[PDB]
Each structure stands twice: as C-alpha cells, then as structure tokens.
Design a protein around this ligand. Structure first.
Ligand SMILES: O=P(O)(O)C(O)(Cc1cccnc1)P(=O)(O)O
Ligand SMILES: O=P(O)(O)C(O)(Cc1cccnc1)P(=O)(O)O
Ligand SMILES: [Mg+2]
Ligand SMILES: [Mg+2]
Ligand SMILES: [Mg+2]
Ligand SMILES: [Mg+2]
Ligand SMILES: [Mg+2]
Ligand SMILES: [Mg+2]
Lengths: 338, 338
C-alpha cells in the first residue's frame, strides 16, 4: 500500500511535533500537561487522515520540488489534520458519554482528568495553528491552509450541532430520523474534515488553489465521507471493539444512525413500536432488543449491498471528476476505506 | 465616558452580527441553535472588551480614514473579542462548575443543554473567523488579526491549564499557591485576551504592526490585566452578585486565588491548619470558615491598599511606555477598571 510505505516516517515525525510544541519556564507544568494530552490522544490510531496529506503531497508535487523542507511541511500538515481530529474526538467522547477510544479509556474518563478535558481538547486545536506558523508562515499557501483548517472546524461543529439536536437525551422521537437529515449531519459532521480537508491541504501545498479543482475534488471526497460515516454507524453496533478500539453508544445515545434510518424505512407499525419503546435508553436489555430488530430486518445484508453500490458510485465519480488530478489520489483513499 | 459614548452603537451592531452569522436550508436547525447560543451568551455583559476595540480604533485611526466601512469593521472586530470571551466563559463555567453568569443561569446548567455546551462554545470561537473573513479578508491587517486571535486563544488555554493543574479537585495542597504561580496563571489566562488582544486588534487595524510598539503596549496592558484578575478574585468572595451577575466558586473549587496567596503569606501555623482543613470543599460551613479567616487577616483592606499601589504603578507604566500612542488609549481603560 502507498499508505504502508509512508506510515513509519509519518509516525516517527510525531516525536519532532511534540518536541517543537514542548519548546518561559513558568508555564512548564502546563507544557507537561500539553505533552501528556498530545501523547495520550494523537497516538494509538491508524493515522489515515494525516497520511492522506503526505501521500497526496507526493502524488501532486513534482518530485524535484519534494525537497527535505517541503516533506517536513507535508508531515507537519498531516499531523495538523490528526490534531484536528484529536480535538473533535476528545470533545465528542464527552458529549457522547463514551467509554473507550483506540483501545484505551476515553481521556475524560481518566481519574484526575474529567471535564478538564474540555480545555485539553482546545489546546490540541490551538496546536494546529502553532505548527502552521512554525513551518508554513513563509509559504504562499499559508493563509489557504489556515482558512481550510478553520472552515473544517466550523463545518464539523455545525454537523455536531445537527447530530446533538436530532439526538435529544430521554426524548425518543423517531420522526426526526430521516435520510435527508442523516446525509446533512454526516456531510458537515464527518465528510469535510475526514476526506475533503486532507486532500485539499495537499492541493494547496502543491499550488492547486483553483475553485473549480477544489469543487471537483469535493464532489468525490464528500461522497466517500458519507460512506465512511455509514460504515462508522454500522461498526458502532456490528463491529468488533477489539478491532474498532471503541465501544458503540449510538442506540443508548438516541443517535440518528444510518441503521435506525434503514430500520424505519423497513419497519412495520408493530416493529416501529418495539424501536420506539427501546431506542435511546441505557438499559442493556433495551439496546439488545434494538439489535435484534436490526438483525430481523436484515440490516447487515442491507449495509453489505450498500457498500457495493456506494463503491461503484464513488468509482463512477472518480472517472467523472478526478481530472486533472492523478486518479491514484482518490483510488488509494477508496482502497483504504472499502 | 468615551465608552458610554460608543456603547449604544456597538450593542446595536449585534443584530447585524447575528443576521450575518445566520445567513443551504438543510443546516437551518443548527443555525437556529447557533442564533440561540449567540443571543444567550454574547449578550447581557458590559461589552467593555469589544468596546475597547471600537474606542481604541477611533483614537488611533485618522478621522479622515474612519469611513462607514472602516467603522463597521471596527464594530465587527469588537464583537469578535466578545465572541472569544463568550467561548472561554461557556467552557470555564462547565470546568469551574459555576451556577450563574451575567444574572442568568449558566448556559450548560439550562435544561436540555448540558455537555452539548462544549460544542456551542466551539461554535462561538468559529464565529470569530467567519466574521474576520466576511469583513476583513481584503484588508492588509487580515492575517495579523487571525494570528492575534489564535495566539489569544492559545495563551488563555495555557493559562486555564495552569489554573486547573494548581486547583486539583479534592486534593488540598496550599504549597502550590505561591505568588510566582499566581502571576503566571493570570498573565496567560486573563491578561492577554482581556487587555492585550483588544488594543492590539485596533493597533493592527490602524496599521501599527511594529514589534517594539506592540511590546511597549503589552508592558502596560499585561500589568492592567493582572490587577483586573486580582479584582475578579477579590469580587469572587467579597463582591455583590447582584452587581457581578455571577456566584463565586474559588474556595469550593480549590483555586489559586489572589486571596488564598495573601492569606498564606500572613497566616500563622494555627491559621494555616484552619485553611488546610476548610479550603477546596463544597460544605457551606467550610467556605464560611475560610471567609472568616480572610476577614480576620484583614484581606479586604490589603486588597484596597493593593488597588491604590497597582493604580499608581500602572500610571507610571503609561508615562514610560504609552508613546507614541495617545495616553488616552490606556487612561480610558484604566478609568474603566479602577
Ligand atoms: O468515533 P465515533 O464516536 O464513532 C464518531 O465517528 C466521531 C466523530 C466526531 C466528530 C465528527 N464526526 C465523527 P461519531 O460521529 O460520534 O459516531
Ligand atoms: O468569570 P470568572 O469565572 O470569575 C473568570 O474570571 C473567567 C475566566 C475565563 C477564562 C480566562 N480567564 C478568566 P475565572 O478565571 O474562572 O475566575
Ligand atoms: Mg462519538
Ligand atoms: Mg458523536
Ligand atoms: Mg461513531
Ligand atoms: Mg470561572
Ligand atoms: Mg476559571
Ligand atoms: Mg472568577
């Protein structure tokens, strides 16, 4: 894989990221807490989002212009994307009352952390702009990158807002769980930061700043992002936690999941009442009841049929909109998620 | 007052700020939640930080260059400072387990809000960069302002980190509460965003971007910021909530307050044990015991003597470092806080 070939170097750059962010002795204790937050949260993942920056940079920039300093900036912008995601996940885990993430207990669930994690999450976000300034201040794409990361934060936060509004705690209303709402949540909430942001960063780094090029790129990447969140919802309930590294909470959290949307599209009036009585509640028995209904409506086969249809749809979109970028930029990402 | 003369216009500009931030129908519900967050949080205060931008702009820019569009940008950057503070306070109220703010219950304490306020706080932060782009994108000071707001967030977050580390819940250790630590907390945590940020924004807007000018300005403004946080700590316990609009929690929160620092400097071994047994705990009786010790050590008179010494010290600093800026830029702010 083109990701496996660049992974080792990317992960080894993390030490430099941390050292640079850790180097006024009065704030030494705060800096040690930042190091602890960085090391706990921005490490233990697959680093696919950050790697997508590095890989896309190598495919878009002329090898002659891929010098030691330009590669360093690519690895740094890659780590900036991982830091953005670390910021969102630390905060999303509090708001979703999650237990584990990347095989360990959620940072806020750690004794002595608690709601202090809210500030820790904001520090991770601040670190992006610290790194963009330290490594890209003198580059012509500097402001493009600042604006792209700020826009990515706004889009995700709007998406998280739709997510929380559609999922009110202890307010069970399935009328809100529609396909139109679902696609809107995921587009803003996941698709921009997970797929548009990494490729767009490498594009700007390669001097590709044209609105039309970014629009064409966005058409493919937002559609891949939608499949990716549908996969995330599927794995929340039917995935193996020893593989996902996290425990699913969508049913207990009354989330507008792809699965509840598909359940509602296929449920008889009798099945609708079962779901109405058991969804969005903490009881193990009620959550087990919902999973049984999903299994009875054969949603895992519906997801597998969707994964196939989605893949063929995204491939058709790469054929239509990849030009003038190398199709490999999008094919490498499509192989990693499908 | 130079603030009273510009207040009405500034507060009336809020409607335009909200309309511009509220104007893709799919995200309509999220936008209505953003409007609710803006209206609840960025309104009910004294708006002194945002007003400081407007007033300083008028004193630094040549009246001939103070056209309709430039004034609009000044009111917008002023509202951006209020939005930064709204972001910090919504999150600080969760982390400090506060009850009220600006005469109403804390946004997170509202039924149906809760930990969703974490995302609401991030949306308020995102709104700054939305406004800076909509109104200052074509201005030569655009990047200066972006960097100044991002640096302000980082500084405050580092300061909040020192604050939370020095105040561990249920871990009563007075050994941490030193004057060196106190000054470090407040400098990063309050002084940069409250006093440096507003004047620096107006300076950049007036084309004053010189490092030496910003350094001289910072020397006065960080010292004013220190007095202001000392005043905030004093009012936390001895202020009138019907005037402050908020209930104090520093004693129950085990905070490194200016008052606990002064108590420790003057306490006998016997008085140290009383404080050790009663500080950083929820019991009304224990909090009453701490306030009695502060009254016995005559800390309100120590604060009044400090307010006098501080004022004379800041005035001496305006004489030394105000040039070439009009001393009125700093005198107007000193009258508002002293
Ligand atoms: O990692 P998670 O919690 O499974 C998730 O994908 C995390 C996340 C955070 C922010 C934006 N998008 C996705 P969610 O949407 O809560 O299902
Ligand atoms: O408004 P508060 O809570 O009295 C305060 O001043 C708020 C605040 C928030 C962020 C940075 N600085 C001050 P604090 O420091 O918690 O005493
Ligand atoms: Mg989650
Ligand atoms: Mg979530
Ligand atoms: Mg999930
Ligand atoms: Mg507070
Ligand atoms: Mg606080
Ligand atoms: Mg206070």
């Amino acid at each position: 894989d083109v990701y496996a070939q660049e992974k080792q170097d990317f992960v080894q750059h993390f030490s430099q990221i941390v050292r640079v962010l850790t180097e006024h002795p009065e704030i030494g204790d705060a800096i040690a807490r930042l190091k602890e937050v960085l090391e706990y949260n921005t490490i233990g993942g697959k680093y696919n989002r950050g790697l997508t920056v590095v890989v896309a940079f190598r495919e878009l920039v002329e090898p002659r212009k891929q010098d030691a300093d330009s590669l360093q900036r690519a690895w740094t912008v890659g780590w900036c994307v991982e830091l953005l995601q670390a910021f969102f996940l630390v905060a999303d885990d509090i708001m979703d009352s999650s237990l584990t993430r990347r095989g360990q207990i959620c940072w806020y669930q750690k004794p002595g952390v608690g709601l202090d994690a809210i500030n820790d999450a904001n520090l991770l976000e601040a670190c992006i702009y610290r790194l963009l300034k330290l490594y890209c201040r003198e580059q012509p794409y500097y402001l493009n990158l600042i604006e792209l990361f700020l826009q990515s934060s706004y889009q995700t936060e709007i998406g998280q807002t739709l997510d929380l509004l559609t999922a009110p705690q202890g307010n069970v209303d399935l009328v809100r769980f529609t396909e139109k709402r679902y696609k809107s949540i995921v587009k803003y909430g996941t698709a921009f930061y997970s797929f548009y942001l990494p490729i767009a960063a490498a594009m700007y780094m390669a001097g590709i700043d044209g609105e039309k090029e970014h629009a064409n790129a966005k058409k493919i990447l937002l559609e891949m992002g939608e499949f990716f969140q549908i996969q995330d919802d599927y794995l929340d309930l039917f995935g193996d936690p020893s593989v996902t590294g996290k425990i699913g909470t969508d049913i207990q959290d009354n989330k507008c999941s792809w699965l509840v949307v598909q359940c509602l599209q296929r449920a008889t009036p009798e099945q609708y009442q079962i779901l109405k009585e058991n969804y969005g509640q903490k009881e193990a028995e009620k959550v087990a009841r919902v999973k049984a209904l999903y299994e009875e409506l054969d949603l895992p086969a519906v997801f597998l049929q969707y994964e196939e249809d989605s893949y063929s749809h995204i491939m058709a979109l790469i054929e239509q909109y990849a030009a003038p970028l190398p199709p490999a930029v999008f094919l490498g990402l499509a192989r990693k998620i499908y």
